[PDB]
Amino acid sequence: TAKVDFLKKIEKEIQQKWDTERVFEVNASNLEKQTSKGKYFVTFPYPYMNGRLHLGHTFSLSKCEFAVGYQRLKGKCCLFPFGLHCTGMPIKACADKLKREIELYGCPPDFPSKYQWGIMKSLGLSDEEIVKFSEAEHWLDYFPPLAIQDLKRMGLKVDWRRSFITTDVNPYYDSFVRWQFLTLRERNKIKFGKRYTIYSPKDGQPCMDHDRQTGEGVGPQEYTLLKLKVLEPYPSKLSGLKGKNIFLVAATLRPETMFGQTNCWVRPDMKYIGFETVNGDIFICTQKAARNMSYQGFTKDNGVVPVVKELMGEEILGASLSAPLTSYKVIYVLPMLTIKEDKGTGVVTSVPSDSPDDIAALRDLKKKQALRAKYGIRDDMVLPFEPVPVIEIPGFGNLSAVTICDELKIQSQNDREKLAEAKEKIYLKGFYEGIMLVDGFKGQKVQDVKKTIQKKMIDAGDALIYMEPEKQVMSRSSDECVVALCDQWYLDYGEENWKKQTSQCLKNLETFCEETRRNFEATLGWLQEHACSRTYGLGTHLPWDEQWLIESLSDSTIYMAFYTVAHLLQGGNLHGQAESPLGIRPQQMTKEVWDYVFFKEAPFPKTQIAKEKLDQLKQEFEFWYPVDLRVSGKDLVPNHLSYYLYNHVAMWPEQSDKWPTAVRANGHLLLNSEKMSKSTGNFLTLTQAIDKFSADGMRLALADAGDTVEDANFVEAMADAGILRLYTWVEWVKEMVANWDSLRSGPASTFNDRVFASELNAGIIKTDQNYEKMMFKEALKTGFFEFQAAKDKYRELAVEGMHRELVFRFIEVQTLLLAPFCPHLCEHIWTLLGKPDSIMNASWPVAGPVNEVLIHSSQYLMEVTHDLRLRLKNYPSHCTIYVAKNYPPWQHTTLSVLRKHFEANNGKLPDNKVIASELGSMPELKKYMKKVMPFVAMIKENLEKMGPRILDLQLEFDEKAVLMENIVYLTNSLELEHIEVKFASEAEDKIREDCCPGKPLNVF
Ligand SMILES: CC(C)C[C@H](N)C(=O)NS(=O)(=O)OC[C@H]1O[C@@H](n2cnc3c(N)ncnc32)[C@H](O)[C@@H]1O
Ligand SMILES: CC(C)C[C@H](N)C(=O)O
């Protein structure tokens, strides 16, 4: 239980030595006279500053910590910088929950954990310090220094000096941002206009992906909205807007179908509003509908619902309606008991002919009289209205809905699953196949005339556009967002000649699997304009309409260029207030200066900055770009990373090269197979993990988390079997330096040594491939779990004791396979082996030629040892083992025949049917067609397990002799007395006939 502490200690001292010799500070002025193999540059999406760093953070970024640990050995020079996001809508939303909690309940509060106060005392804060966190700017004081201490404490390979904060509190970053956005307005990628977006009324601004708590992908979804005029007489409750004209307002998606209205659906129990539009009319719907319309300019005042009256639907029942389009000049409001209150307007269009719900429920009101009677509806309001043909889908004729409803045997509006199957297999056809019937459009496929039917209804004033968030959107601040129609500066991602270009960048980008790339391709063709113009929350100010601020997904996109110069500008002061190393004033970074630094061919600008500094920066940036690698969750694919090509494409539109190169999406970290939830008692800040399991102890489990795009897992129990094998290895290397002698002076020629060194070399290679494929689970598997396999194997098979020079080799090479993973343990180990330098300077271990047939021989060996420890738990002293020289007769036939079926079609043995068929057809297998089809099966098994080598008429290595090279170990672990190995020709009938090479038999 104190072995964990054995790890923590050497960590703290190794970290001390590291940043006092400043091992991780790289400069590009130094490393441009010496091209290693090039540069290596990785970034992590700088995280939000509304908290310590949690674990899911650390697993998403482990990925680049290991990339550079590895690529530094491989010899590249590493730049791993770290920025800190605050330009958020997160930091302020939190500060405001805390503000309104202090002011509702006191300091110390008193409530009727789950309140933000209780989360802030969960960080050990005195009372009067949690109070100072109410305006957002105490966060920018507090959390960034904590991220930098939490990162140096995990031991990451990071140039402090290039780090920074992101709101206008940091001047330099702000000047950078303004430069970007001047160039963007300049090149016609930022526009202004009245557009649609998701929008939070409490926020007073657009609510885009990173400002949300729910529905991070949703956007505006359109509807047609129909006006139904209520006709005199009004029902008993519409009485006092004696003046105005009164409208039922209903949401639909199939405007072409509106010819077949027979009525109108409301739910007797639902709460409906009536309110005064902009032109003095009374619209009737749900409060949520109205609020959505208000923000889209339906109301006199934006977002204010002038509520004229309130009521359940039950009072509306029986109102007469003039409806658009339908040749029923008078229809009625009827009760549909099952209306979802979320989507739409609480009023639905009854097209019995093409919605199944509708023909169902209309049947129901016709069917039994008490369904009318309870809602007091007259019969003239229901019975005289039969369904109506408008779409003729080919499969089904005029009346598609009622047709497919009578064949699924429907009887009420609640058979909801049968109904929904119907709506699938009718609606989707209706779009493509369907063909219109009504005059004018007599016979066009609806896919075409849908839009123009709709326009026709708008201009005769009968219908209006209505938007709605698709699935619901929560905001950070907890206000249920709506679409709004508003003034906005925005990014023009729907342009043709920009989407073209960035999707080219996508083709050239490297995603590490096919699915991550289909996500990019998905959102590219989906992405249109993106509203970046905000008005509340921390950040940076739009330099020409300064009431606007830049939202977080839009000032985040090309930030990595700055990462290359921060150390020469802020020098590492996070707020950049400390003077600049280069001496350059923030007030001196005008566009033309940035322009110079970044665009290769810009002109030196009329600036007071001596030419040498500007060259230092231009140089640095040009050395480190492009971005070699960005790492992240599967979540930033549909927003930040799409916007990240798009922007790089538009910034250096010319340099194909300055674009990003590669991008690797892991999933969301789980905890012990559990959604990692602060409420479920199932959670771990990094500050916390690093003291529970050592930082090496942690990183180890974080390699084994996952490399699927699919959500990876973190199991604490395995973090512990990890601290285990680490302390046994360190005690093991203590053990080997203490016994330099009871190892073997002289030549390492024994059979097992060749085997073990050819194995250690195959491990160095598999680990190299797994590191460069960035599969840190398998890089672990090969590089360590099996390195220890092959070490213990040669611990056991070497009865002669193990060879000194080979031991210290394995020590070094293991320790180097591990450095990217646990650099503190390895640093300790490497100074144990007394080497003079820091292990960060080591070259990747070189691999020696790999003896294949050897390793097959030792595999064969090990396998029959397993087999014979099995057959032994039964009943002895003597053993005798038999091994057949040639395959027996029936088997050299069945395997000269699987040789012929393998040789004739590039390796595809036909099915079980062609094989057993042509083996019953050879007479020499008649007594043995009971043993001729298990055998081929076992063959196909290993023909799928260790190569086609099992199809040779003769092995690659003397069986009998390989046996004989290791027999001592066998009698000693098997604890017998003597074992004969006869060549299976002197054995009995059963043994000489059922024994094949590769699977010997034996007796006691
Ligand atoms: C650049 C700007 C637009 C973004 C801003 N800096 C920001 O998003 N900060 S953050 O706090 O949510 O993102 C930090 C990183 O960590 C990854 N990640 C997050 N959660 C998890 C998780 N549960 N499991 C695994 N990985 C996670 C995530 O992909 C992201 O790259
Ligand atoms: C009854 C419905 C099919 C009417 C409209 N097309 C909708 O989907 O809401």
Are the C-beta atoms of 648 and 663 separated by less than 8 Å?
no
Candidate of 355, 359, 391, 446 to mutate for ligand 2, largest count of ligand atoms within 8 Å of Cβ: 355
Residue keyed to tokens 């000693």: 972
Nearest protein Cα to ligand 1, atom 12:
47
Q: Which ligand is nearest to the CA of 550?
A: 1
Residue type, 749: S
Distance 46 CA to ligand 1 centre (A): 8
User: C-alpha 964: how far from its chain's center?
Assistant: 54
Closest Cα to residue 891, out of 953, 799, 956?
Answer: 953
- Resolution given for this structure, in angstroms: 3.2
For residue 101, CA distances in Å to 27, 134, 382, 689 come to 47, 10, 54, 30
Give the H or E element holding residue 729. Answer: helix 716-737
Helix (H, G, I), strand (E, B) or coil at 961: helix
Q: Is 767 exposed, middle or buried (0-12, 13-18, 19+ CB in 10 A)?
A: buried
Give the H or E element holding residue 402. Answer: helix 400-407
d(CA 850, CA 762): 6
DSSP 785-836: IIHHHHHHHHHHH-SS---HHHHHHHHHHHHHHHTTT-HHHHHHHHHHTT-S
| Bridge partner list, 813 | none
Checking DSSP bridges between strand 549-550 and strand 1001-1003, what pairing results, if any? unpaired
d(CA 452, CA 439): 14
| Bridge partner list, 856 | none
The residue count for the chain? 1004
Checking DSSP bridges between strand 549-550 and strand 629-633, what pairing results, if any? unpaired
Nearest protein Cα to ligand 1, atom 18:
57
Largest separation between any pair of C-alpha atoms in the chain: 116
Give the nearest ligand 2 atom to 254 CA.
6
| Bridge partner list, 249 | 227
Q: Which of 430, 448, 469 is the last residue of a domain?
A: 469
First-to-last C-alpha distance (Å) of the chain: 47
Closest Cα to residue 263, out of 315, 335, 313?
Answer: 335
Closest Cα to residue 509, out of 620, 654, 652, 646?
Answer: 646
d(CA 146, CA 153): 10
Going by the annotation, the residues of the binding site for ATP are 678
The tokens describing 497, both together, are 């000649």
Are the C-beta atoms of 159 and 578 separated by less than 8 Å?
no
In a domain, 442, yes or no: yes
Give the other-Cβ count within 10 Å of 23's Cβ. 13
Give the nearest ligand 2 atom to 358 CA.
1
| Bridge partner list, 881 | 981, 1002
Contacts (Cβ under 8 Å, ≥6 apart) of 473? 198, 207, 212, 214, 215, 218, 480, 481
d(CA 143, CA 50): 7
Going by the annotation, the residues of the binding site for L-leucine are 46, 48, 553, 556
Distance 53 CA to ligand 1 centre (A): 10
Are the C-beta atoms of 143 and 50 separated by less than 8 Å?
yes
Helix (H, G, I), strand (E, B) or coil at 475: strand
Helix (H, G, I), strand (E, B) or coil at 517: helix
Are the C-beta atoms of 401 and 355 separated by less than 8 Å?
yes
| Angle at which helices 823-832 and 716-737 cross, to 10° | 10
Distance 526 CA to ligand 1 centre (A): 23
In a domain, 817, yes or no: no
Are the C-beta atoms of 166 and 147 separated by less than 8 Å?
no
Q: Which of 406, 438, 469 is the last residue of a domain?
A: 469
State if residue 669 touches ligand 1 by the CB under 6 angstroms criterion: yes
Backbone φ and ψ for 273, nearest 5 degrees, come out as: -110, 155
Helical segments of 823-931, H only: 823-832, 852-870, 889-903, 912-919
Distance 211 CA to ligand 1 centre (A): 13
In a domain, 362, yes or no: yes
- Tell me which DSSP letter residue 215 carries: -
Residue keyed to tokens 């709460």: 271
Q: Which ligand is nearest to the CA of 706?
A: 1
| Strand residue runs (E) in 119-259 | 164-165, 190-200, 205-206, 220-231, 246-252
Nearest protein Cα to ligand 1, atom 9:
47
For residue 313, CA distances in Å to 284, 321, 348, 367 come to 10, 15, 12, 22
Distance 824 CA to ligand 1 centre (A): 26
The tokens describing 432, both together, are 């493509």
d(CA 542, CA 545): 6
Q: Is 368 exposed, middle or buried (0-12, 13-18, 19+ CB in 10 A)?
A: exposed
Residue type, 362: L
Q: Which ligand is nearest to the CA of 208?
A: 1
| Strand residue runs (E) in 344-440 | 348-350, 391-392, 435-436
- Tell me which DSSP letter residue 955 carries: -
In a domain, 333, yes or no: yes
CA trace torsion 91, 94, 98, 104 (10° rounding)? 130
d(CA 891, CA 893): 5
DSSP 677-725: -TTTT---BHHHHHHHS-HHHHHHHHHTT--SSSPP---HHHHHHHHHH
In a domain, 498, yes or no: no
The tokens describing 776, both together, are 């840190």
d(CA 493, CA 484): 19
Method: X-ray
In a domain, 594, yes or no: no
Give the nearest ligand 2 atom to 354 CA.
3
Give the other-Cβ count within 10 Å of 212's Cβ. 19
Give the other-Cβ count within 10 Å of 948's Cβ. 11
d(CA 782, CA 776): 10
Distance 125 CA to ligand 1 centre (A): 26
Give the nearest ligand 2 atom to 257 CA.
6
State if residue 85 touches ligand 1 by the CB under 6 angstroms criterion: yes
User: C-alpha 355: how far from its chain's center?
Assistant: 38
d(CA 48, CA 85): 5
Q: Which of 414, 438, 469 is the last residue of a domain?
A: 469
Closest Cα to residue 261, out of 315, 317, 321, 319?
Answer: 321
Are the C-beta atoms of 325 and 258 separated by less than 8 Å?
yes
Contacts (Cβ under 8 Å, ≥6 apart) of 173? 164, 165, 166, 540, 559, 562, 576
**Rg, the chain, Cα only:** 37
d(CA 623, CA 537): 35
Checking DSSP bridges between strand 482-492 and strand 190-200, what pairing results, if any? antiparallel
State if residue 635 touches ligand 1 by the CB under 6 angstroms criterion: yes
Residue keyed to tokens 């930033």: 636
Distance 295 CA to ligand 2 centre (A): 24
Are the C-beta atoms of 368 and 332 separated by less than 8 Å?
no
Q: Which ligand is nearest to the CA of 221?
A: 2
Distance 357 CA to ligand 2 centre (A): 9
Backbone φ and ψ for 632, nearest 5 degrees, come out as: -175, -175
Helix (H, G, I), strand (E, B) or coil at 658: helix
Closest Cα to residue 137, out of 108, 169, 178, 110?
Answer: 169
What residue ranges line ligand 2, CB within 6 angstroms? Answer: 252-254, 348-349, 351, 355, 357-358
Distance 224 CA to ligand 2 centre (A): 10
Q: Cis ω on the peptide bond leading into residue 233 (within 30° of 0)?
A: yes
d(CA 567, CA 580): 9
Residue type, 612: E
Are the C-beta atoms of 331 and 262 separated by less than 8 Å?
yes
d(CA 549, CA 171): 15
Domain membership of residue 988 as a residue range:
855-1003
The tokens describing 313, both together, are 């639907």
The tokens describing 143, both together, are 């959390």
The number of folded domains in the chain is 2
State if residue 155 touches ligand 1 by the CB under 6 angstroms criterion: no
Nearest protein Cα to ligand 1, atom 3:
553
- Half-sphere exposure (CA, 13 Å, Cβ side) for 16? 7
- Tell me which DSSP letter residue 843 carries: P
Residue keyed to tokens 């007489």: 233
d(CA 698, CA 869): 37
State if residue 45 touches ligand 1 by the CB under 6 angstroms criterion: yes
User: If DSSP states are collapsed to H, E and C, what string results for 313-364?
Assistant: HHHCCCCEEECCCCCCCCEEEEECCCCCCCCCCCCEEECCCCCHHHHHHHHH
Residue type, 920: G
| Degrees, nearest 5: CA angle 658-209-774 | 50
| Angle at which helices 823-832 and 3-20 cross, to 10° | 80
Candidate of 167, 627, 635, 666 to mutate for ligand 1, largest count of ligand atoms within 8 Å of Cβ: 635
The tokens describing 877, both together, are 């002293």
Distance 633 CA to ligand 1 centre (A): 6
Backbone φ and ψ for 132, nearest 5 degrees, come out as: -65, -10
Residue type, 214: T
Distance 254 CA to ligand 2 centre (A): 7
d(CA 81, CA 566): 10
Give the nearest ligand 1 atom to 85 CA.
6
Q: Which ligand is nearest to the CA of 554?
A: 1
Helix (H, G, I), strand (E, B) or coil at 248: strand
Contacts (Cβ under 8 Å, ≥6 apart) of 520? 506, 509, 511, 637, 641, 642, 645
Candidate of 48, 54, 55, 57 to mutate for ligand 1, largest count of ligand atoms within 8 Å of Cβ: 57
Going by the annotation, the residues of the binding site are 46, 48, 553, 556, 678
- What sign has the CA pseudo-torsion 295, 297, 298, 304? positive
Distance 266 CA to ligand 2 centre (A): 13
Checking DSSP bridges between strand 629-633 and strand 482-492, what pairing results, if any? unpaired
d(CA 641, CA 231): 54
Closest Cα to residue 551, out of 570, 568, 532, 579?
Answer: 532
The domain that contains 307 carries what CATH number? Answer: 3.90.740.10
Nearest protein Cα to ligand 1, atom 22:
56
Helix (H, G, I), strand (E, B) or coil at 223: strand
Q: Which ligand is nearest to the CA of 466?
A: 2
In a domain, 111, yes or no: no
Residue type, 778: E
State if residue 60 touches ligand 1 by the CB under 6 angstroms criterion: yes
The tokens describing 273, both together, are 């509003």
d(CA 818, CA 617): 36
Give the nearest ligand 2 atom to 344 CA.
9
Q: Which ligand is nearest to the CA of 211?
A: 1
Nearest protein Cα to ligand 1, atom 19:
57
In a domain, 993, yes or no: yes
d(CA 594, CA 489): 23
The tokens describing 326, both together, are 């339908």
